[PDB]
Amino acid sequence: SASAVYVLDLKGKVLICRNYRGDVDMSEVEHFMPILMEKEEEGMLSPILAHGGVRFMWIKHNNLYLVATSKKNACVSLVFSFLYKVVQVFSEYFKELEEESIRDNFVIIYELLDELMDFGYPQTTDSKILQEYITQEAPRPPATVTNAVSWRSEGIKYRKNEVFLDVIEAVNLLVSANGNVLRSEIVGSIKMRVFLSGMPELRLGLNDKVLFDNTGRGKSKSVELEDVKFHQCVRLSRFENDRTISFIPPDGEFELMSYRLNTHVKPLIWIESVIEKHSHSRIEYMVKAKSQFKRRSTANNVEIHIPVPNDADSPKFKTTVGSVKWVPENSEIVWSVKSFPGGKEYLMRAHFGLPSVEAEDKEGKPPISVKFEIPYFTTSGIQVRYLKIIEKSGYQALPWVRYITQNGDYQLRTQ
Amino acid sequence: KGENTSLLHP
Amino acid sequence: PIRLRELIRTIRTARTQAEEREMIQKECAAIRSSFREEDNTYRCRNVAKLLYMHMLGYPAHFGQLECLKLIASQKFTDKRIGYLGAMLLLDERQDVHLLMTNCIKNDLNHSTQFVQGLALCTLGCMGSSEMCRDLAGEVEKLLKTSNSYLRKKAALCAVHVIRKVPELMEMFLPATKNLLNEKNHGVLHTSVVLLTEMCERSPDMLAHFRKLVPQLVRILKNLIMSGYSPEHDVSGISDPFLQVRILRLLRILGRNDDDSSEAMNDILAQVATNTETSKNVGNAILYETVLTIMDIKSESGLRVLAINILGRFLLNNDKNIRYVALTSLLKTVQTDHNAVQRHRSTIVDCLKDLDVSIKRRAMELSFALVNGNNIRGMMKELLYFLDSCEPEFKADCASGIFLAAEKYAPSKRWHIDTIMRVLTTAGSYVRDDAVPNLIQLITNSVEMHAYTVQRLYKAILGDYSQQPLVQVAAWCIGEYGDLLVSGQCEEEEPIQVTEDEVLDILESVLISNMSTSVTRGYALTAIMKLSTRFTCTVNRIKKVVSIYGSSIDVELQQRAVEYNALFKKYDHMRSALLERMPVME
Amino acid sequence: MIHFILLFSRQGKLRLQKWYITLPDKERKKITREIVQIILSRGHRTSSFVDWKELKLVYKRYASLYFCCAIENQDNELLTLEIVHRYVELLDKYFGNVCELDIIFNFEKAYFILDEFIIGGEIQETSKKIAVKAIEDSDMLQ
Amino acid sequence: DRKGGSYSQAAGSDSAQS
Amino acid sequence: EIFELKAELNSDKKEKKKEAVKKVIASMTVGKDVSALFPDVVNCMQTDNLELKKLVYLYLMNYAKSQPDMAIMAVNTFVKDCEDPNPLIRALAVRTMGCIRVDKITEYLCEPLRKCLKDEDPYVRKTAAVCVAKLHDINAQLVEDQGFLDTLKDLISDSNPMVVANAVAALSEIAESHPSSNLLDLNPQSINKLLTALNECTEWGQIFILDCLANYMPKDDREAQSICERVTPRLSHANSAVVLSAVKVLMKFMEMLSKDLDYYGTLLKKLAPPLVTLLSAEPELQYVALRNINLIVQKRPEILKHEMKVFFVKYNDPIYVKLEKLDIMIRLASQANIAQVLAELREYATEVDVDFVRKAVRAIGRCAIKVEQSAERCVSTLLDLIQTKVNYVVQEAIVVIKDIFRKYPNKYESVIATLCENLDSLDEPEARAAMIWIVGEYAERIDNADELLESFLEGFHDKSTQVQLQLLTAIVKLFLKKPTETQELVQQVLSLATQDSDNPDLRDRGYIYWRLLSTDPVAAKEVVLAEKPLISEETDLIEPTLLDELICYIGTLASVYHKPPSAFVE
């Protein structure tokens, strides 16, 4: 229940503001910057600010803080969801999120803000629906918003019915300094870019453990996602009733389902680091990377980031496979490898000097993270069974899907 | 701007 | 070799703080890589970039050995860069200037004047306790030189050494002898500054330095005679720095002697009437002359002229002029106190001025001008100022009012009422340290306790969030429970104190979340003392003490346990250790 | 003497800094930030004099970049303003139409001029032409 | 070709589940 | 500038009027007071172009409060636009009518609001409901006189499920500011109708639909079971706000649910995956999710019993997120994951955040105090932190040791020797007082207690009131226990705190100690050095009355602040 949502700037200037209830004065935005500065200097800065009896909830955007001032005890989660929807709509309409587009599309930006929410209650949240009624280059509102199906616009015609799916896998491993993995969770991502004619109702079917157990086929390799979230077009009733993933696919790229469950398998890449750091004399980087993934899968664009000393200079890299580049801005050395086949063993030996004068304050030990991304690999083993594409007119669809395995929160605690 | 202006304007 | 201008342009081109930090880190990494190879060709550019990064707020610990290496170099640009690095990133606490002592000693005898002058300036700016000990002889050697451009540097180095090492001023006594005839303005100013520093450091040289009073008076008269100056003459005042130094020396010279004041009395009188205060330099010179006259044993006419000048400057609309007048009035508070009473209206008006510095000066002048006759009249003004004062001045105003009441209170009853009003209105602005002083004052006064006890009881039941007021009320209750309530042993007629409201208030304060563990301890001590002090409410505080003995705080838990043990095993001995504490100044 | 003299811009950026008292780097940064906040949070009718930490914090900027000084409470207040004005005039004469942009590019020259003018917080060159001539001679040395 | 795994054809439903 | 803009706006050229409107909009957004040109734009308001109409309406809304008198020349335009055939124009007019904060403007807009109340277009219906809600908020008496409550109530039982959700949200907002008289509560048929339309509601309408169920109090197990079954599908929604609303509704319904029935167990089992999914949300919603988990933790702590790995603070997590994770771990700490909690605290103690290090130390101390099985592990961790040579870490370890000694000092005698020489030169009052209290109470395993207290007695009269009291108590305890080596020390302490101590409480304590010493030294052992009872630690759990109230208020600003809804609003 934010009183007014406004877009700020890096210098405190409000790029654009739009009051929705009028219960909060527009002059409260000026005091938001001093409050944020005081909070940052004291460690008490939070996204939800508080200016007396009015709370100024702000979200750190790409270039401006989306401050949504509120007065009463409005839904904080609702305000955050509205801000996220507004950010997504702006990203869809404008490819750049900065001051260049804030002051360049004000005529359409004001109309979009007015149409999105009224009296603090959001009304329009579909990017396609908003673009079909408000454009920067007006007819009556589309019937899709009024109709029940607000995620599948009717009347869409295409020459070919091709849908491109993406089995995105995020391998996150939380390995402590002792060598044991604490947080090892893999989050699935079933995103399909449906581009067909009409409003087909997708019938999602995969090798789900629950579905296999219900059907009596709980003996093969089935993916048991701890948390499964359906898309907006996905009908929750069918999933709760018999796990039937039946919903109208959206026009374009959208996230249908996103699995999320813990992983009990060995890490895809095993990286062991050795720190032979002398006392203000030199530093040793005994970094050894072992590929725990299958040899048939290659980790393309593998970049194992090893944090080097903050004051370290004149470093020498003695590795075997993969180029090592030291970035002064990042204050770390990334063991970048173009192609990392499974089972490969890469050994590196870093050596650099240190300044004679000791550092005044400590810099910490940031965890070492790798950027391995091996496509065409299904670590979870979940295989899609079928995709029920049904249309009233009747057409032969040719859906496609690709499985991509990447490294997410794969951070290894430093020694 | 305000930076190119003379400090004393003399 | 990245130029300093290129680095500045790159820094200015960055907008985001993260991008600027990344650029600074990259520049520092490049500088460290260049320094690690022992580069000496582009060392000036690297030093300039490191200095710019340090000024912007970036670490420069690794850029310490390079500055030391460049200091012992031969290039003039490299030497200047090293000197700048030593002055900026080198300090006594840094510990990297210890090796720079040899470089300074080597450059102290350098034939080039710029190198020697730069080294002297660096030594003066970064004077250390150990560097001056090994460089005191070198400074004294250059003090006897005839170089006008180096005489000022030698005087500054000697002054810095004396300030850092007061025990080394004994070696500068004969070096500055016969140095009041320097034609150069800079050399004369340096000599005057050195003499003033020597006089202020120790009074043994005051008699020796007081013999040059006629020479200083003659020099000041000669300077005043020439009202124009092609060099050092700005805004119609020739040698304003020299005039200010002469006035300061005259004020500090002969401050407790009649011969010194009489010798400079004519010069002060001439300056007080032969100087125009239209410009800032003239106003500063007049203020310095007035301060010197006030701080010295001047004549009645000189004091009257200084008072008139201060009054005229008080009416000036300039904020700086008003601040200077307020500072002069505050300094001349004890001296010419009767003459300062004529500016009571101006002091009162300065409290309502829209200048923070002006308001503070007016408040300080009002506080310092409070006497034994205007204290009662000024009490209302002080209370009004405290009630409608700024948040940063409310605590100071309350402290000043309390100090005036404790120092020049017209009566104990009036002082007690003023203290109670300040505590009630100060709230959270009353200092916690003033609580012990108020407790001591209450304990010392043994004639006004019933009225004070009643007032404390009335102010305690209304509010309890004021830590100082709450602590004062608790201490008063603990000290005079026997007098706050009379005949409260059993049920009686309805009075202010019924022997049960105080216990409930103490329990609420102890259990209230608005406790800082200090007022809670005072309340617990008062409750424990009330077991023998008050005989009406008995057998009930023991249960609270026993329950209160398991408090989270270790000290509070121990106090509660001790109180419970005393109540359960030393009931007859409770009154044997509940005697009133002695009252002392 | 002057405890510390720092030139800070209106936006808060510091173009100059020269402290005559040895203080910790973190403590010095905190003091500079507090001085900037006090100057940035002060009006134009405050007399340009602030008694912060028992120091005559005198702020007087003739342009967008302001200047601050910290001297002990033992001399007249107008003396600090006169010294600041003389230093500004000397810097303008040495450079010629001194602006904010020229100050950043001439940081080394400004530091050298300040060192040659005032050392240890005390006045070292009372004259305005002698100091300029000495600075020019030092610059011409190479 | 495409990085991250080549696109593969998908069925309509579980033919073995009737 | 202003004159040129006025001349352009007072022209008959559409391009010039559009350029003037765009310039005025840009000036207003840039921070230019364009309210003086509002009367000029009043004439150039009835325009066929929709782009100019929207800009004119926005200028009037932003210039309505500034110039209420000049807003009287727009009632006719609003009335004319309220009957526009285009649904977008009608919706814009309805939004502008409710957005104009004019006391005399809404009075003449009652007829347009009544006309648009029965609009067939779902967007028109939503706009009319929003305008009615805005009018009721601005003037409750005007809304009551217009009789819009009946129209709002009937909007719930109609088509346009998004419009139905908008009407339901408007009715809830009106009742939220209402004093509870004549509430809009519905019977179970209304709840069933809302649940049926819940599946067809949009992302925004789902929150509005779930908000109505938050105020309804179930009275039967079958109704509660049906509500739980209906809200179960809401837990599989990508919307974080919808998931949070469903979780809050389930928690509220669980208050009347029976633990014997298997519905509560199924709800608890299905709630854990939702909490795990919410814990991996965006940083802005991470704090909200942590606050919701903490609020629901005190109600059903067994729901997240096995949720411990996700509570670990990530390296890239924010300071607020790390603090919330540490608080969740402290509240969810158990003997099963005691080793994991200790490892996280040890790993969290190596960070560069002083506040984060202090929070980790406090969490470790709280875990050690709450669970006595890890008392040895907590003591070892505190000793390691002290030996780490960190000033803040050393102070935190000293505070933890002092707290443990007062709580579990039966087996704390093995750390007195280690803590006897532990860089006691720190002048921090929190660590110094704790060390003094530990030495005084544990003055049995240290043979140099008097020597250690001698260094702290140099500035006892000017150290601190609490520090001075702790030092006096330690000296008294040492004299009572071992007066042979502290007979002179006790007298010196009494003289310093009795003659040179001007503190009232400190002076009274010193006088009491001196009187006890001079009356009966034997009785001082049983009076001063007595065996204190068990220390009652302050419970961090909220009161049951506040917990029940906080269950209904799920997702609001009060949940994040951990304050009552009426204790935070102005």
Swiss-Prot record, chain A:
InterPro entries: Adaptor_comp_med_subunit, AP2_Mu_C_sf, AP_mu_sigma_su, Clathrin_mu, Clathrin_mu_CS, Longin-like_dom_sf, MHD. Residues 160-413 form the MHD domain. Pfam families: Adap_comp_sub, Clat_adaptor_s. Disulfide bonds: none annotated. Phosphorylation of membrane-bound AP1M1/AP1M2 increases its affinity for sorting signals. The modification N-acetylserine is found at S1. Signal peptide: none annotated. It is found in: Golgi apparatus; Cytoplasmic vesicle, Clathrin-coated vesicle membrane. It is a peripheral membrane protein. GO terms for biological process: endosome to melanosome transport; intracellular protein transport; melanosome assembly; platelet dense granule organization; vesicle-mediated transport. The modification Phosphothreonine is found at T144, T146, T215. Keywords: Acetylation, Cytoplasmic vesicle, Golgi apparatus, Membrane, Phosphoprotein, Protein transport, Transport. Adaptor protein complex 1 (AP-1) is a heterotetramer composed of two large adaptins (gamma-type subunit AP1G1 and beta-type subunit AP1B1), a medium adaptin (mu-type subunit AP1M1 or AP1M2) and a small adaptin (sigma-type subunit AP1S1 or AP1S2 or AP1S3). Interacts with MARCHF11. This is AP-1 complex subunit mu-1. It comes from Mus musculus.
Curated annotation (Swiss-Prot), chain D:
Widely expressed. GO terms for cellular component: AP-1 adaptor complex; clathrin-coated pit; cytoplasmic vesicle membrane; cytosol; early endosome; Golgi membrane; intracellular membrane-bounded organelle; lysosomal membrane. InterPro entries: AP1_sigma, AP_complex_ssu, AP_mu_sigma_su, Clathrin_sm-chain_CS, Longin-like_dom_sf. Its main location: Golgi. One of its GO terms (molecular function) is clathrin adaptor activity. It is a peripheral membrane protein. The keyword Protein transport applies. Keywords: Coated pit, Cytoplasmic vesicle, Disease variant, Golgi apparatus, Membrane, Protein transport, Transport. It is linked to Psoriasis 15, pustular: A form of pustular psoriasis, a life-threatening disease defined by repeated flares of sudden onset consisting of diffuse erythematous skin eruption characterized by rapid coverage with pustules, high-grade fever, asthenia, marked leukocytosis, and elevated serum levels of C-reactive protein. Adaptor protein complex 1 (AP-1) is a heterotetramer composed of two large adaptins (gamma-type subunit AP1G1 and beta-type subunit AP1B1), a medium adaptin (mu-type subunit AP1M1 or AP1M2) and a small adaptin (sigma-type subunit AP1S1 or AP1S2 or AP1S3). PANTHER family: ADAPTOR COMPLEXES SMALL SUBUNIT FAMILY (PTHR11753). This is AP-1 complex subunit sigma-3.
Swiss-Prot record, chain E:
It comes from Homo sapiens. Residues 9-18 have a biased composition (Low complexity). It is linked to Alleles A*02:01 and A*24:02 are associated with increased susceptibility to diabetes mellitus, insulin-dependent (IDDM). In a glucose-dependent way, allele A*02:01 may aberrantly present the signal peptide of preproinsulin (ALWGPDPAAA) on the surface of pancreatic beta cells to autoreactive CD8-positive T cells, potentially driving T-cell mediated cytotoxicity in pancreatic islets. Allele A*24:02 may present the signal peptide of preproinsulin (LWMRLLPLL) and contribute to acute pancreatic beta-cell destruction and early onset of IDDM. Residues 2-18 are annotated as: Disordered. The modification Phosphoserine is found at S6, G12, S13, S15. The chain holds residues 338 to 355 of 365 of the full protein. It comes from the Eukaryota. Ubiquitous. Heterotrimer that consists of an alpha chain HLA-A, a beta chain B2M and a peptide (peptide-HLA-A-B2M). Early in biogenesis, HLA-A-B2M dimer interacts with the components of the peptide-loading complex composed of TAPBP, TAP1-TAP2, TAPBPL, PDIA3/ERP57 and CALR. Interacts with TAP1-TAP2 transporter via TAPBP; this interaction is obligatory for the loading of peptide epitopes delivered to the ER by TAP1-TAP2 transporter. Changing D1V: Allele A*80:01. (Microbial infection) Polyubiquitinated in a post ER compartment by interaction with human herpesvirus 8 MIR1 protein. This targets the protein for rapid degradation via the ubiquitin system. The modification Phosphotyrosine is found at Y7.
From Swiss-Prot, chain F:
It comes from Homo sapiens (Human). This is AP-1 complex subunit beta-1. It comes from the Eukaryota. The modification 3'-nitrotyrosine is found at Y561. Keywords: Acetylation, Cytoplasmic vesicle, Deafness, Disease variant, Golgi apparatus, Ichthyosis, Membrane, Nitration, Protein transport, Transport. Belongs to the adaptor complexes large subunit family. Adaptor protein complex 1 (AP-1) is a heterotetramer composed of two large adaptins (gamma-type subunit AP1G1 and beta-type subunit AP1B1), a medium adaptin (mu-type subunit AP1M1 or AP1M2) and a small adaptin (sigma-type subunit AP1S1 or AP1S2 or AP1S3). Widely expressed. GO terms for cellular component: AP-1 adaptor complex; cytoplasmic vesicle membrane; cytosol; early endosome; Golgi apparatus; Golgi membrane; intracellular membrane-bounded organelle; lysosomal membrane. The modification N6-acetyllysine is found at K305. The chain holds residues 14 to 583 of 949 of the full protein. The keyword Membrane applies. It is a peripheral membrane protein. It is found in: Golgi apparatus; Cytoplasmic vesicle, Clathrin-coated vesicle membrane. GO terms for molecular function: clathrin binding; protein kinase binding. The keyword Metal-binding does not apply. Its main location: Golgi. GO terms for biological process: basolateral protein secretion; determination of left/right symmetry; heart development; intracellular protein transport; kidney development; melanosome assembly; platelet dense granule organization; vesicle-mediated transport.
